[PDB]
Amino acid sequence: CDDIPRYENELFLRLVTSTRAHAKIKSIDVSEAQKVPGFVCFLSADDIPG
Amino acid sequence: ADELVFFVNGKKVVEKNADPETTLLAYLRRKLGLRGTKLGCGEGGCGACTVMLSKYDRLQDKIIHFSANACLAPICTLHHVAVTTVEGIGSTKTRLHPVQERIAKSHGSQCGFCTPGIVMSMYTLLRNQPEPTVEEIEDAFQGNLCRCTGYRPILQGFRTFAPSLFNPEEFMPLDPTQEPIFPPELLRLKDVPPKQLRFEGERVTWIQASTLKELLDLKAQHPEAKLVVGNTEIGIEMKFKNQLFPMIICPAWIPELNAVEHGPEGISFGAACALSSVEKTLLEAVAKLPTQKTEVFRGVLEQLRWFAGKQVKSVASLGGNIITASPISDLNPVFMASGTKLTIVSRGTRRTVPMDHTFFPSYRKTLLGPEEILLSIEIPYSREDEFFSAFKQASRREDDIAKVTCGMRVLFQPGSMQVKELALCYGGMADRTISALKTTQKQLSKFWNEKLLQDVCAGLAEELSLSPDAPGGMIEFRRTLTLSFFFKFYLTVLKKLGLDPTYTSATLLFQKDPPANIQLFQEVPNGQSKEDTVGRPLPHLAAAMQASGEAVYCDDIPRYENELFLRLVTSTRAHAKIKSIDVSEAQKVPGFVCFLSADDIPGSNETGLFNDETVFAKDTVTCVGHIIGAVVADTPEHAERAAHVVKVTYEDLPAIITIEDAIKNNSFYGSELKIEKGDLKKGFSEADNVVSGELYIGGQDHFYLETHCTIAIPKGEEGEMELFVSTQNAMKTQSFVAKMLGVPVNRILVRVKRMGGGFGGKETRSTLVSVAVALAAYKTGHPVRCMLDRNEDMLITGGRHPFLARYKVGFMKTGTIVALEVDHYSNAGNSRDLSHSIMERALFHMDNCYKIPNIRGTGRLCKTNLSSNTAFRGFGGPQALFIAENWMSEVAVTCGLPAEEVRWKNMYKEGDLTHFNQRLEGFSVPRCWDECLKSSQYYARKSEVDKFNKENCWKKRGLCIIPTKFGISFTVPFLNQAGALIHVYTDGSVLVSHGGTEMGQGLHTKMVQVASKALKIPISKIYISETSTNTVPNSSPTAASVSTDIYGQAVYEACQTILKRLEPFKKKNPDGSWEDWVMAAYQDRVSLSTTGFYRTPNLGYSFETNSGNAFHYFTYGVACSEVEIDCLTGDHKNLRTDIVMDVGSSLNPAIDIGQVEGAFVQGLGLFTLEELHYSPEGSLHTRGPSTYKIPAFGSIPTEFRVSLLRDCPNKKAIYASKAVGEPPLFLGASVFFAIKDAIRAARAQHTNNNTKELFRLDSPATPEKIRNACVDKFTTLCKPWSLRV
Amino acid sequence: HFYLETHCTIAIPKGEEGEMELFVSTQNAMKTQSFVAKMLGVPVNRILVR
Amino acid sequence: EMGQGLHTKMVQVASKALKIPISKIYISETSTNTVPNSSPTAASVSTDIYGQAVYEACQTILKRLEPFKKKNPDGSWEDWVMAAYQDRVSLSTTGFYRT
Ligand SMILES: Cc1cc2nc3c(=O)[nH]c(=O)nc-3n(C[C@H](O)[C@H](O)[C@H](O)COP(=O)(O)OP(=O)(O)OC[C@H]3O[C@@H](n4cnc5c(N)ncnc54)[C@H](O)[C@@H]3O)c2cc1C
Ligand SMILES: Nc1nc2c(c(=O)[nH]1)N[C@H]1C(S)=C(S)[C@@H](COP(=O)(O)O)O[C@H]1N2
Ligand SMILES: O=c1nc2[nH][nH]cc-2c(=O)[nH]1
Ligand code: MOS
């Protein structure tokens, strides 16, 4: 799969995962992620169209 | 280097390293990933690249919006401009803009490749005028071309902004308050006064001058620097003439070059003012000022009506037109005749000079010094006793290069008819704009009278001479126009000084009546389910995505990061030995990867349908355009530049170019083809009359708006390769790529999503590109792609076969035919390809709709040093049908009988046998004919035509009604086969795959309609993604108009298997849904996957025995057309066309009427506008829309009526439908035969009174052929010692 | 599992009618296709898994 | 294919059933637009069930070629396949198996 050449406009996804076995998600803050060069977006449940 | 800062669809773009050679189109497509804007020509003629530009006007304190060609707009002209593309106005993902919704719902989009360009032309109009007039709407599209639709539905849908195929009450009204705002950041930057900018590219430096002082300093330091305003000349010079200007200055910002001053002698325009600004100022002047003051202004406006289109007029500068000094400038003759005043400046100098004959001393030069720039132009008020005309004649009225163009001015002594000043200035008659000074000088102090007319004509004939080797040719036509223009001026001036009423129309400037369009078709039965869409006018399923720019064509596929570009290296010689190839210059171009030739091929260099072609030339080239090799580079521009400097050394061989050359040299492919029935000798013996002649029909270029293109992806395993191809023939693409690689066919996957046009051009000739790009992917191990530039496409890929015919027809005094012999010769070019099958179909259509008891037709394929000719919509049919109607037209003239009576009395009857012994069953021509005669009011209009011809000396009308029949099936029996593959997924959604490809004809739409009816589920549950060789193998090319018939049956059969498998589940749960039955089948382990297959029964004609069925059935139709010719210029109007087409029970009357209108307009193009010109040495001159004129929006019949015949089920095809793709093209010949009728009226008037003369009119009947056939006192002005008595 | 190739997906959005082509390291192209379709809220016939 | 040689076994099966060399048979990939509604490759059963499905597809091809084989019994596989194509016989089929 990853040997397939990338498109010139191909982006890369990295999963954000829980560090807790069982918890409420109180908030998510992406304000530090946003400053990393080449950041495109943060996806979460609300972005799902279906 | 400065930052370039502009906006695209409201989003700021900061380009830190602008290259001055970068076009907006390349930037949009390759840097911003907005692939809705298309490349169709790269030369400003097609409008596929249209965008809207918006900027703040300093001098007007307002936001202005205008259209532009992105192919010619340098990004370096766009600092602080806002661009809007198709993606900026709407999308299927958000909401369509009214313009998008209406072109899609109106059936204005077929292949869809022109749709974004036409959307952006219409959008721009609406942003300037939210409630335009019908004339403003038509004028929006002077610079847009569509090959598919025949324009009628685009204009009728958009007319809504000023049973049924569409319902305008469904349409969302336009709401200008909801348009995207002008970018607020741009409106803030309007406050900061401009600064000089510098952009540095790989080869070119660009200075944007902010002030006049900066401009004059730069020109003093760099006198060689090219100014660029519009780039509509320099862009052509750089791209097509291999010119490199290392320094460019753009003075477009300078207020003095943009100023408009109303003075006492006239109106001054800055040299950077756009022609559209000039036009708007002069129109306002003509509305406000007295007639006598605006004579020159109205001359300028008349030329600007016919000057390119909106996109080019919105960016083209006055100063650019004047200083380019093209021999064919439409404005320089007007500026010269009027003595328009030119203000010229350099650092520390300024002068004003009236333009006169000395301003243009030689080819492309003016009397500016190298340090000088044109600052401003004053177009003069006309005086008392001063009159002006301006005239342009070209190949096509709209967006064309002048053949001849002029400005004419006369000044009389006060209150008199006595000439004080006369100026007749012409373009197109020399290497510069010229004045007929010798001629006009002899008339000073003469009076405006018949003797002055005769003297000026004889003088123009002597002074404006053309040697037989004049560039452009058409020597007799151009000389005639120079006189014919003066005659029009002469009569116009008599009227303005004050004519016989039969002379008045010669003085009228072009005027069209408003359009009238009626479509008639059959309502579906009262009881038919709403989910059964068969027989309903369902729009093309991709129409909305085509209108939004979301529809992906091959080059729109994103490139891989490691993807390379291929440029073909082609022969510049008709026939030569290749002695050496030197790549040493090419290897120096940055990003050069390799040069490929025959020796790089790992399998076979033998290719082509008959194995008689090279993949790459070896030892010899056999046409101009013959592919020798290919450059691969890191960008398309680097591939182009490197290919251009590959040096091939040739040794010329004797060349055979023309049909006559081939006949003389015995250069033919195979032996004569022949059909013979009855007894020719006895038939000619019985004949009252015999006419013999010869006829020629010119070729045709497909002009698919999307040119050929292939992406080849090498997988690096077992020879595997996946190709994305613009082709009608995925199967031959696969086998040809496999044969060249020397790998099994099972290693090669070809995928065809859609084509932006094919029209037969992509049935075989697409492999020329596919196999070269596949070799490049094989050799590099990288993805490679190539999309042909228009000029490469026209040169290399072939066209319709030119035909020469020798005919002999025996008939009775009644017009009844008793004998016919026709010898056909086709120009086949340098390989067989489909030439043999095309000649077979020509021979099968030499009868048209006429019973001929004694008949012999022969065919020869001429083998020539021209690109190989191929399939074109009609496939030999249109040539043979044209030859038929030409001798039929001559029988009616010879007999002195009305042509419709002679056609009717010769027509086949139900159950007759053709000349190839096939029985005509359901022969509907008689119903189409009687209905077309009635609804066209033919008889009443024939007397109106005769009345107009009596009342008009210099204009004539013609009327003709012709039938056609078209045999439906591949003439190659084994091609009449079709496969489908259908999957039902566990959600009940259906994926259909079939062997057919989509090129705009709505095949996938019809196949979805067919599957939805067969399965009894809504179309919403069925999808067709693409065509691919790993879903349906061994597919026939999408060709011969049979795709709906054969893929419809294969899909139908696959649906029946699915129904039979679900039957047990439907029975067990009769109240269930589709989804319940499908899930229950899945859970019971029943397969929801099947093939379908169809084999057309009872086909197999033999030329040896003249027996067996050639065709499954015939599609029939009738067309009546009326034209008006201008006997003095050769221009004509298409006034009215009525068509009645038998398409059986139409699966989709919107798509079928669209096929009839599209086909009819491509035929109209074939017979009246489209001409390819070649050097005596075999080099194509005509290689883009600038010189090859396809039908334009303004070309179509003004009243355009289409009816589909009612109550005519065809039991020989799927749901009682008939093939419609090709059959209607020949009906375009109705316009040709109406033009011939009109020319006979012109020749009765001024040539001779032989009412039975047979003058030869070849195809196409261009303005040259029409003007030259109208023999008169003018053609006559434009010798041997002894003559035997 | 310690498959030497970890999980991998390439997703290519075609931009037309919700169409997507996915290259996937999976034993279950069918559930990949129906799960991607369910999340997008498009019919399964729009999703190609290779 | 995950390393267990399923494609290898399916080529070996198709070669035996068709009586042609494995060199004439190729498997490129698995795709939802060629075979829909597939069970996951699992439970060790893929050779058993896809082997049956391939077998049955090969039996349909052989039945289609049979008239051409009987017409030209000394001909090659390639002669029979071209004769079938020219006679407008379909050389595409599904196979299926239900345990
Ligand atoms: C599709 C199409 C259709 C066309 N139709 C027609 C037509 O019907 N009739 C016709 O006559 N032309 C036609 N043209 C030609 C062209 O559009 C016009 O000549 C136009 O006026 C050129 O102006 P521009 O600003 O684009 O010139 P550019 O290409 O920007 O420059 C043209 C030349 O003028 C020089 N120049 C420009 N401004 C000045 C100045 N102030 N002082 C000195 N030198 C200057 C430049 O150095 C250059 O040599 C057509 C072009 C296209 C692409
Ligand atoms: N819009 C559009 N219509 C078109 C074409 C095309 O390329 N674009 N090709 C024509 C030709 S040459 C043929 S043979 C048929 C093939 O399609 P069909 O068999 O599905 O009618 O479409 C005709 N109509
Ligand atoms: O080989 C053929 N190719 C064709 N294209 N369109 C009609 C055709 C025919 O009769 N034969
Ligand atoms: O038969 Mo159309 O591809 S000329």
Ligand code: MOS
């Ligand atoms: O059944 Mo194997 O995929 S655990």
Ligand code: FES
């Ligand atoms: S691509 Fe720009 S006008 Fe044709």
Ligand code: FES
């Ligand atoms: S729809 Fe206009 S070129 Fe095809």
Ligand SMILES: [Ca+2]
């Ligand atoms: Ca072509």
Ligand SMILES: [Ca+2]
């Ligand atoms: Ca040929």
